[PDB]
Each structure stands twice: as structure tokens, then as C-alpha cells.
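Supplementary Methods S3. Input chains for the assembly prediction are listed below.
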Amino acid sequence: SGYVPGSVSAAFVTCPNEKVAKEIARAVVEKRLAACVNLIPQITSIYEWKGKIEEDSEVLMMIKTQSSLVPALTDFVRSVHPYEVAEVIALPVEQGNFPYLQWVRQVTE
Amino acid sequence: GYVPGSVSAAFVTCPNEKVAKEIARAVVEKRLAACVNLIPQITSIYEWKGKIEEDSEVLMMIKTQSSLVPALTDFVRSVHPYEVAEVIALPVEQGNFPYLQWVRQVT
Amino acid sequence: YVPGSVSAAFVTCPNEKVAKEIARAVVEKRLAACVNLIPQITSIYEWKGKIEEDSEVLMMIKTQSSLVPALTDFVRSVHPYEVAEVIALPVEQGNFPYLQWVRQVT
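Predicted C-alpha cells for the full assembly:
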């Protein structure tokens, strides 16, 4: 078959450490809010806070799910994330491997 | 003058660095892509036959013309060890024109 | 949240020293809310008919889409390479409070 552009998205989420990242990744995949999560360790986050530059050690999550599920995914991550304001941003997938994209929709449907 | 979306960023997951490098080199050699960024030590968590699984992998970020994503995907699945290779591409809307221009020329 | 009003831009640098210098500067000048540094990247590209493999650092920058042009000019002015890699992708969804924060600090 084909693929509807933008029907699948990749969401990025930053976590304070590997333990937290793994906990949320397993939960969202089990709850079928996502089909796949890639964890990238050893990240350093830089931003301004209280008039000073902060450099933190974090883990970055790349989450592949149905674009229509991102709101629910964001609600879940927000409810269990240790941060008061968790970074969750999602980008639409326009092209790719159809059987893979088809799989993302099925296991999350 | 960059045409929004004419260049795309594609993400591919490989089992190990050896495979990632072979595919990455072939892709640039064959001009299906201008550049490939390999991110080692990735942990993937996904479903498989109803059960949750965890694998150690390498993530590839490939930049190329959006028009070439289909050819790139076909090639990646031809030599990728997995049955269903992860290949997703996101459109680039803005950036550094000279670089975006270069991506176009080498592919 | 207005779809596409925030973007994530990627920039690669030769080492963590340059990446951090550029990251701290864009945040300081409020050209971006935050930057995530991904260390130990291997870049494979062609140049002069040969395949190169360099060790590098990847930067993921979150800012207002309207700020990408300025962010790009600044990066190009302080970046060590002649032709710096800077590509931006629009954010269509996400956690509204985080997205609004990005707009606020920039």
C-alpha cells in the first residue's frame, strides 16, 4: 500500500537520566501510545536560567508514533515526567519505508 | 533561494556500527545522500509479537534531496540486515542555503 | 500552539569545545531557548571525490521558526567551517507549556 504524509510523527523528549528515560519508554510502548523509542545517552542540555547558563546531563528520547496520538502521548509523558515542564516536540514524517510506517500504525492502533 | 522541503533529513536504525558504516559509505558513494551522521550507543525499545524488547543500536541521520528519499529507502532495505528497516524522513524548511545547495549538488 | 511556529535546527561541529561555545552564545543572545548536545558522532560525507569520516558533535536547537534566519547568520559567523551545516525542521505538535516557554525566552 501507500503512506499518508504526516500520519506518523517523531517526538523528542529529554529526561534527566537513563533510569527515567527507560521507565517512560517502556510504559508508552506498553500502553501502545508509541511503537518505538530510541534512547540517546550522554546528552548535554544548555539553556539560560536565572540569568546564568546551565549545562545539564540528560538523555534524549526519539519516539515514533501515530501523529494523531501525540496529544495523548504528551499527556502521559507530562503526568509521569519529573520536570514541571517537560520538553516534548513532535515532527511529521513525510516519507520513509512504507512497511515500517505501516507497522508503527498497526502496533499503536 | 532554498525551496522549502526540497532537502530532507532521514533517520535509519542499524544493529551495529559495522553495518551502519557500510550502509552510510555506500549511500554517499552511490550519491543517494550528501552526508550521514552516525549516533552510536542507542537503546531501542519497541514491541515485538506483543512483548516489549530492548536492543542496542546505531542511529543514522541522512541528509539528501527529498526527491531521492524513495531511491535511498529502496537501497537501504536491499542491504539492511533487518526484515523491515526503519526509515523515516522529515522535511527541511529552513537552514543554511550554501549547505542546502551543496546537498543538492553532490546528489 | 500555532503549528510550525517553533523549529528544531541541527548543527554539527568539529568538537565539544566549539559546540558549547556556539550553544552558550545563541542561548545568551536569546536566538534559541535551548540546545541539546549529542557527543561522539561520526560524519560520513564526500569531498574531493573521497569519503571522509570525521568525529563530530551534533547540536539540536529549539527556537522560534521566525528566528532561524538570524540563528543561521550568527552560526555562520562564528562557526569554524567555511560552510556550516544548519537545517531546521518545523514542530507541529508538543507540550504547549514547553513550546510557549520557547517563544517566551526568545
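Chain B has three helices and five strands. The beta strands of chain B are 7-14, 35-48, 51-65, 87-92, 94-95.
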